[PDB]
Amino acid sequence: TSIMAVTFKDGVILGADSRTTTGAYIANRVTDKLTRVHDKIWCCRSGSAADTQAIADIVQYHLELYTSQYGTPSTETAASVFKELCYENKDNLTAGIIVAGYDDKNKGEVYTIPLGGSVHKLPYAIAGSGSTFIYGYCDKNFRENMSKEETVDFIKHSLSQAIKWDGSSGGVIRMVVLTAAGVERLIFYPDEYEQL
Amino acid sequence: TSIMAVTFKDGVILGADSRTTTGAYIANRVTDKLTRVHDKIWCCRSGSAADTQAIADIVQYHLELYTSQYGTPSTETAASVFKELCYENKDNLTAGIIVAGYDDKNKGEVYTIPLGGSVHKLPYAIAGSGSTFIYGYCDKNFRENMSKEETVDFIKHSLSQAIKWDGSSGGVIRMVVLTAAGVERLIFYPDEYEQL
Amino acid sequence: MDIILGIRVQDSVILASSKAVTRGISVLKDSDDKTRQLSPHTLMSFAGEAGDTVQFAEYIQANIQLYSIREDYELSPQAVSSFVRQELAKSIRSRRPYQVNVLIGGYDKKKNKPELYQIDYLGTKVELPYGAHGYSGFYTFSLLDHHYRPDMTTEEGLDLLKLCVQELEKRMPMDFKGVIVKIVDKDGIRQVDDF
Amino acid sequence: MDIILGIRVQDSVILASSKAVTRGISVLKDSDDKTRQLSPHTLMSFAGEAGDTVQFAEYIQANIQLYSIREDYELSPQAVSSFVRQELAKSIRSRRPYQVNVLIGGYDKKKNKPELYQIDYLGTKVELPYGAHGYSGFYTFSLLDHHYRPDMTTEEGLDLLKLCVQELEKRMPMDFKGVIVKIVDKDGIRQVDDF
Amino acid sequence: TTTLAFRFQGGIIVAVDSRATAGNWVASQTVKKVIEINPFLLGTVAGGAADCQFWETWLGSQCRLHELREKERISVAAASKILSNLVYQYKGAGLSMGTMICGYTRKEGPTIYYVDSDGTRLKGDIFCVGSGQTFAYGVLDSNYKWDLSVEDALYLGKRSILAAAHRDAYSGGSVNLYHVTEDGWIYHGNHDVGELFWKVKEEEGSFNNVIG
Amino acid sequence: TQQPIVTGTSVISMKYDNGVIIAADNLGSYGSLLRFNGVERLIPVGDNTVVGISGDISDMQHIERLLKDLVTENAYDNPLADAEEALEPSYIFEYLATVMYQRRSKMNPLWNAIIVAGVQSNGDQFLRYVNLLGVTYSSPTLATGFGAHMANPLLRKVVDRESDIPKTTVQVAEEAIVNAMRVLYYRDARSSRNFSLAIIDKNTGLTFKKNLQVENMKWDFAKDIKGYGTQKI
Amino acid sequence: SDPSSINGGIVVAMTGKDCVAIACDLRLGSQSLGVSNKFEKIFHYGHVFLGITGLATDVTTLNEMFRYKTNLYKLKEERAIEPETFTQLVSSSLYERRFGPYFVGPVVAGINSKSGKPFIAGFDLIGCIDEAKDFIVSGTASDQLFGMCESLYEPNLEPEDLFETISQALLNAADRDALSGWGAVVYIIKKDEVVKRYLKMRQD
Amino acid sequence: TTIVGVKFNNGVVIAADTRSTQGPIVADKNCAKLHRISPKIWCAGAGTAADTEAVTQLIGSNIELHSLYTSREPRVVSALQMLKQHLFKYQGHIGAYLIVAGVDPTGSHLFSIHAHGSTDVGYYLSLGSGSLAAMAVLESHWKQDLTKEEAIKLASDAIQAGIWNDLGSGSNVDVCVMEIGKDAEYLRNYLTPNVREEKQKSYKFPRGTTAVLKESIVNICDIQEE
Amino acid sequence: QFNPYGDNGGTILGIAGEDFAVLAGDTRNITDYSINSRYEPKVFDCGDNIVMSANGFAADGDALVKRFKNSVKWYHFDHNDKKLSINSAARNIQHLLYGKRFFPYYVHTIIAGLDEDGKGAVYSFDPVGSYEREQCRAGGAAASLIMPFLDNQVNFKNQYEPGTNGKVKKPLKYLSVEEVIKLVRDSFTSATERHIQVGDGLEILIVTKDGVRKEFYELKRD
């Protein structure tokens, strides 16, 4: 799995491959690892498909009930609900989740939640098996306050390399853009990103 | 360990960190992992220090005896002697070796020999625990027929990132330049490469 | 414990049970009675893990004695054996199962017939003409297959039982210190003091 | 095998050895002689793993008999015991060690003294007034500690030995089917046929 | 450990050693392995030191509560069965106990019960319990009779412990003697093995193997 | 029972004449991967205590929230919350020490080693250690992990026993801590150059220093080292 | 299972003024079972004394081995071996079995016949030489012996005083060990006379 | 164990503590961990005591024969090569962890050797259970162009750090200095900062306190004439 | 796997005099081959003229001492400020220890004080609550080194009277507080020499009818 979330001037963009594997067999080559817990709060999922789904489903329920009582939740709040589940059930879960959201007050924010259940607020985050191969690239090429087009290219190039080297990662590069304008879904196919 | 060898216009350059570790303790922070098996045939060593030393010592003996009988050996020949040792004793060895050399006929050549004992001739090669983090960077930034100054910068930037992320790698960045001009040793300290 | 035998003849049931109690390396006792009277015409012998054997036997005894008082009536050997089996069948899927094998010899006063039931610790019940638990059967069943006749007298049953004990004393490695023999018939339960 | 005893008295050595041979669940034999005459005035009893015991005993016997012919002379019990110990000490660090414990009872014709040596499979030699291998000593050493006086006659030694065998027959779990007793003195080796 | 108890004409003899070990290390030579439950009940301890003390001390509390409730001393059978039923609840948990419950009552006479952490409960005339039990059995079985004088029976029990104290590495220290009668138990002193051995060797003429 | 995932390395500390110093690098390691480079592992509680935590970071964050909640709870129905009935280092420590031992006793430990450094109401220096097993001890110098093996020896050359504490100034103590941090960067494979340092003085109060770096490092001699024995070039 | 503690036993050596003392218990057992109370663990080759604890078969084997070697030494050298030389011979012999060792704790004691200097030495099972000035301990009650020796011992003791110190060190150490005791022997060694004393101790 | 090596202006110095331990027990309080391979090549040893002794003796013996064969003074690299190849052959089972130092016609040298047969070069080195305490001192106080007096001080200070802070190390400090164009000086018990205090009491017993059974003279002399 | 136990080393020693008692213990605290503290008090005054030390795993040791001190407090509340006698304290501690029979306090406990007749008393415990009154007891890491020395020098074991040769034993004369403290100090000096987990400092608590007094002595720091 190769997943990443990157903050930029207008908000935040989530990025992911589309490969699900049972060992060396690709069980699903068109998986959607970018999943919605609220209107403008999404997450990238890595690790167990069952665990991350069950977690995400529970978070979406909590934030839906939060909204009915207290209005729209912050991205930090969403990350805290993810953490609470991941931390308290750490013995039985294998879930690496990146939470990303857009407020009007806080703008684009990214929180990463690795296996342990700890929370880390970052400008950008990378995770999944394939992320190991792009720590060098991402660190060298990331800038703060990038444009939308630059951030899309940064994620596209990054995940392209992660896919190239990681067997567990592949298929299409899905992306989700979170800004004041709304929610935009992007997709990039092998023929496009492999030649980069 | 972060090691790499890169061919360029005038020949080939070997690069390495200087960290030797017993678990999390750094047993030696100024190790020389670039070692000489012949005048202009060197190697980068990764894995067991004892194994790679014993192997390198035996190879140097074989190439010294080769030279006394048949004159200067090719880089391919040196790689074959490394392979023979690594392959036939694969059950008892933990050695990841990159062989690099300069002929006048063949110019700069690089052969990588991973755990299995297989041989792979490449334009450039990376190895050691820290190499995982720079597959993305190195693939994106490598060009063939670079200049000496460009190749030094490419290795410096690459190993800098590998060191940054890999705990097993660190210390100084040693380099060895192999050209028709001769053999040049380069060293780069933390204050220089960390700020890159 | 070690060896427990049973044989149903014409008009009675005979239960033979070893006297030895061995812990590890020493024979602590050579006169141990491995049986309990459940009712006037029903006797249960037992063998298995230390502690569990007696604890189970006395527990069963108490329950049957309680039934006898409540109803002022003796349960049939078949009824008692079914109760015992259910307890063991319940036991086997418990946190800590009773590790006990039993023989239930009884005389049914209604049908005027002797009855012998063999039940293992899993709750495996079988009615038999002759039975045994543990390594005893490996030696004795072949003898009983040959000599047994269903119409034997009690004296003939005891002679056949002696032939079983002699074979066990010859070929078994463990010294079980002889057996206590008890007869169950229409007149009740009695012990053969010389064997 | 199971129980082997030894007792050195005034003018002789007495070795008692069980007759039973048990394999798993059956006593295959009840008249097995667990001893070999190494020389006219030296006897070795043995116990340990099946096969190894006899194979070792006969091997030692052959070597001592070979020495006797070559030199036309009988080795002292001390000399024989030292030879046996070295073989076992050599054996313990072999690919497959001899799993055999032995008692060597002999009468030294030079010194006119009986001698009893106890050697285990590791090659641990000790000269003793009385000895045993396996679980036998746990019962018998306490009796021998009490009753043994060194100036005892052969008849008194046999009575003391009977008291040891009686205690073993009372408290040991395994039926070892009695013992074969042999006496080693100035006149040589003989077997007590009634015990 | 070596503990024994046997019935005879003059009631019951109880004899125990005093050693406690942790591996090869001798932890104590002065351990009280007889527990005075009441003026008529004794308990011997063998195996786990804490298990035996705690539960035999506890047993005395249960026996006291019985005679408060029933206005009558507890029987040896009932006292032993309280302990055996208790340890049976803890079966599998890893309790390590080998005990004799010794006493006298009018209805029972002199009685000995062997109680075990496996749940074994046995009535009997003679018992030896512990790592050195086999050594004690040797002396006891060869010299036992019903018609023994209190004086001779006491010596036999003392001598049987000595035999085991000598041979068994995990037994020793000293011998505690008790004599249980119709009118209750009587303590007969602590006998150090270091002095008792040489005394017995000389007077009895035994242990001719050892040099002294 | 668990295994630690994201981990923090050594926390080092020592007493000096008027207070205590504590330091810990800003790294959150993920095995051999030096994953997170901006982790604060010194957490102040009021203006008189600093808790330095090593080991599992997720459990550290849990402990961080417990302390935050402890301050809130202490303020409830407490007019002297910022005066006589303010939280003491000894109170904060004992609370943690209770929690750590309770959690180990339920076979579900907080996988940490903790050093509570601070100054009491009466001006006494407080410095005590507690870890996942609930083990506690105090000493003029305290260190966790690799610090125990490398920092303590250096810090004990400054304050070897109790009578050395009044003789040690804040400048000498800080110098020793900063030197120890450099040594750990040379030799601990799971350390970083960036670190935080906190001083709790009975006169000048709590001084919290962020974004410190290891400097004045010796590497030049590396150029002269060639091969592993016989090699000359 | 552990070879060094199947049979049990202890040896202790001490230096005094112009004298050395070596002592050992007499027990040989099979774990809990006591077998022999006459198993001496101190041997001598000329004026050099060797005490050996550990596995009894090896104790016997090594004794026979060093007798073998010291006898050949003497025939060729035309003189008795000295304690310093013998110590080296023990070390050499033990280390040649580096990866299949004799399970023993040897202890050398004696006086150099030429210099008159008292000498003691201890070894681990693979030949490491511990050449102590004060005392050497070995066996299953080595901890106990260390505690006794470290407290009781003082330098330059006279032969008859040294006897009391080493005896009390052995006896009280043995009494806190289940696998040691059953009698004891003490050798008092001077340049040209050696006295051997059997001690009276508790037989449990 | 704490062993260290420190290069200086005109040579090299090695040092070591003197504690040997079997588990938590101190087997020897004044153990000699500095071994002589040849007159001007010495090495400090850590790990298994018999192994460091034996491996040093063997290589030292062969170095002596080699020196006689070649009519040349032995070199540190020769000892280094012979040691590493021996240890490597035995795959770490020979538990010798060595700091090898010395002076020869090529110059002054300092190396380390691990049980698996890997070698390292340095100006300062430390090995053993107290190597972290020692290396902390070396990393804090070492500099280039040390004098002989400064190197001995630094080396002994590094050992002391081990002695005090590491339970596996203790007692005394042994030093050996090997300077170019000079005899190597072996300073046995250079420092002695752990002398035991006077005991409160004397435990000398009254003669006849111990109970005796038998006495006898032991014949140590040969078979006699006449 | 998580191991809930550890070993903090150290060693303790209790000796019962005729009208006094001492409980001594070293002040070193360790894990593996590292020193945690050179002065970490191990022997505690628990009130009612009782001193206590729970040597072994310090976390369990501190927990036990804490819980016993608590038991003394509640004994006063529940029983009209009655003084807890040393024998009663010992039995109470047995129940604390055996309470965790199946997850033990990994400690060797020793308490010291005076019995109800005013004589010196030392009680010793195993980890699961077995206890026994003794005149003399060393506990912890170096207990194997110290106990034999005490059998010899406190109870006069294997010591006889000159001239008689093994016939007459040395009489069991009582020891004064000055004589006991000498034996304690020599015991710990000897233990420090041959045991790596023992050293740094020795702290002794002396209990008499007048109260609880403390004495501290330096030990070797290597």
Ligand SMILES: *[B]([O])([O])[C]([C][C]([C])[C])[N]C(=O)[C]([C]C1=[C][C]=[C][C]=[C]1)[N]C(=O)C1=[C]N=[C][C]=N1
């Ligand atoms: B990715 O490779 O981590 C991916 C993310 C997931 C949310 C779709 N995980 C998987 O594909 C996992 C296996 C795995 C690979 C690498 C690390 C951890 C886990 N696959 C499944 O969980 C799976 C496979 N087949 C069917 C159902 N679930």
Ligand SMILES: *[B]([O])([O])[C]([C][C]([C])[C])[N]C(=O)[C]([C]C1=[C][C]=[C][C]=[C]1)[N]C(=O)C1=[C]N=[C][C]=N1
């Ligand atoms: B590098 O980290 O792979 C490095 C290369 C070596 C030639 C110096 N290896 C080591 O440092 C190894 C450990 C190791 C780390 C990572 C992968 C494989 C192996 N160290 C040693 O072999 C070593 C450590 N201490 C003493 C001696 N040898």
Ligand SMILES: *[B]([O])([O])[C]([C][C]([C])[C])[N]C(=O)[C]([C]C1=[C][C]=[C][C]=[C]1)[N]C(=O)C1=[C]N=[C][C]=N1
């Ligand atoms: B005895 O050997 O059974 C003895 C009786 C007990 C009451 C002291 N038991 C022990 O000595 C046991 C160990 C043991 C040895 C042999 C067989 C069974 C058990 N020791 C302890 O219970 C113990 C208690 N506290 C400290 C040290 N040892």
Ligand SMILES: *[B]([O])([O])[C]([C][C]([C])[C])[N]C(=O)[C]([C]C1=[C][C]=[C][C]=[C]1)[N]C(=O)C1=[C]N=[C][C]=N1
């Ligand atoms: B040091 O602690 O590394 C030291 C150096 C040695 C050369 C004297 N090592 C030892 O003291 C070793 C520790 C050790 C214990 C057990 C197995 C392997 C290593 N001690 C011994 O080798 C030792 C122990 N007892 C007697 C003799 N030698």
Ligand SMILES: [Cl-]
């Ligand atoms: Cl999915």
Ligand SMILES: [Cl-]
């Ligand atoms: Cl290397």
Ligand SMILES: [Mg+2]
């Ligand atoms: Mg790094």
Ligand SMILES: [Mg+2]
């Ligand atoms: Mg034997």
Ligand SMILES: [Mg+2]
């Ligand atoms: Mg003993």
Ligand SMILES: [Mg+2]
């Ligand atoms: Mg010490």
